[PDB]
Assembly symmetry: C2
Homo-oligomer: 304 residues x 2
């Protein structure tokens, strides 16, 4: 029993972290096979970041300008290319600790673990979600760029995020491992405002199911609702619309607890309308939305 | 910017997890050098757990009865002994992945990361605190016993906790790596009730400092208080007494933000008396107490 914001074990990813330096900028890189991936803004000076022309800035860079260090040993760079907003540095040595891996582009609402790194060294691991406005709420200081987000399926690491920047509001923006930013963000130090940070409804319902499984049941009421009725309330509270696909995804949790998805929606509707009244659910005084239905099943069944 | 409940990178500990089986019971063990540490209740049947005589039960066990598997390979047990509530299984092979390590017994209020494991395999990592009633609020299912809690200082892992049991209230109890339980708990399936789960005041203040550093400042007021005045309010709200030692520990955070510790105490006093009024601090609607002043400094400075 008990339910925690749990991250994947980070060992497999720790073995891939390297330091990348270009000129006076040092950030992190991900070493998989004989390629090191890192944000292309490693080639920029803080000045260049105001209006960078990456192709032009890259022309002044040679392989020997990218210093890649794995632990305390230097890697030899034999090629470099830009793919969208990431640089791929070909090295002469395949990473011996390369795990089985995939590059995936996640959708908003999906969660992942972040291994925060500085100078190619892991500092901590925490669990995040891709917000509906394509930002993440991380914990990143200067030097953390190139830190990655990932999910693990037994022994295969699916990398989904690479840290690139902090918006002036303190939220974070980054790319998938193909260098495409999540959302409309750009690797430029300019006016970039995030949209509405709506609540991930399907995740809240999943977490309410986790609460029932773990004994916190005070919020269960005698009501039911419909998808259309619930969605009128969801719109009012800046919650994402609940679809039949979400109801289907919640099916295993509904089966395990015996609580119909629409009955849980009515409980959530009353929680939104009446508040928590000073009470807590799974140690939280707010409705938690950074657990997917898959995370709830995984944590409640002990998948390794 | 941003502040997350962050766990230490778990790689160093993942390399130490093994599976221990005795009869029909399988749990986790920690393999450091040529010793595997595990809860002594591995020798019990669910029946034995009602009133176990561990010394007597252990007489019927030989080295060959403890099956230790590291990954998919079997370790040879050449000795076994009981130290308090843990078994030490001497194996013929030193763990090649043994990190630099120490065994430490933490005090209530101290935080640590837990690597939840099943069948010797890591399932997830999360951050915990030793509660003032010597329980922890973890996420542990059957099979998770022997999962460990730890802190890391650069390359040295200080193991502080080994999971042993869940109380009938859903909270967790375990030992240090010398086998001594935290608190009054015993490895017996009997009536064990936890005491008052008071709030770790020094940690709340540390987290309020983290909030100020990260821009969440609405709760800062025009007031100050004294240690004695604040402590009268702390007693009323089941908060731990704040001592001059705690004020001293908060010194670096007070210096960085320019907010005197007693002024932050007055802000906390008003938060306790008036509530949050539907507002949040660092994404939380309750006062968070599972970040120590050291964790706040570490996360705010990027220690690797």
């Amino acid at each position: 029993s008990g339910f925690r914001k749990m991250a994947f074990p980070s060992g497999k990813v720790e073995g891939c972290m390297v330091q990348v330096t270009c000129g006076t900028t040092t950030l992190n890189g991900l070493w998989l096979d004989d390629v090191v991936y890192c944000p292309r803004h490693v080639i920029c000076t803080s000045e260049d970041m105001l209006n960078p022309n990456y192709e032009d800035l890259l022309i002044r860079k040679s392989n020997h300008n990218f210093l890649v260090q794995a632990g305390n040993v230097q890697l030899r760079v034999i090629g470099h290319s830009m793919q969208n907003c990431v640089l791929k540095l070909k090295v002469d040595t395949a990473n011996p600790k390369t795990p089985k891996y995939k590059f995936v582009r996640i959708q908003p609402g999906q969660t992942f673990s972040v291994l925060a790194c500085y100078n190619g060294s892991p500092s901590g691991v925490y669990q995040c979600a891709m917000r509906p406005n394509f930002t993440i709420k991380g914990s990143f200081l200067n030097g953390s760029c190139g830190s990655v987000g990932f999910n693990i399926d037994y022994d295969c690491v699916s990398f989904c995020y690479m840290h690139h920047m902090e918006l002036p509001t303190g939220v974070h923006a980054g790319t998938d491992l193909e260098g495409n930013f999540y959302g409309p963000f750009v690797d430029r130090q300019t006016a970039q405002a995030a949209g509405t940070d709506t609540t991930i409804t399907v995740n809240v319902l999943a977490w309410l199911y986790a609460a029932v499984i773990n004994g916190d049941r005070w919020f269960l009421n005698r009501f039911t609702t419909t998808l259309n009725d619930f969605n009128l309330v969801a719109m009012k509270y800046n919650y994402e619309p609940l679809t039949q696909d979400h109801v289907d995804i919640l099916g295993p949790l509904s089966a395990q607890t015996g609580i119909a998805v629409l009955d849980m929606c009515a409980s959530l509707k009353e929680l939104l309308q009446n508040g928590m009244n000073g009470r807590t659910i799974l140690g939280s005084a707010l409705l938690e939305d950074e657990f997917t239905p898959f995370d709830v099943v995984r944590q409640c069944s002990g998948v390794t």
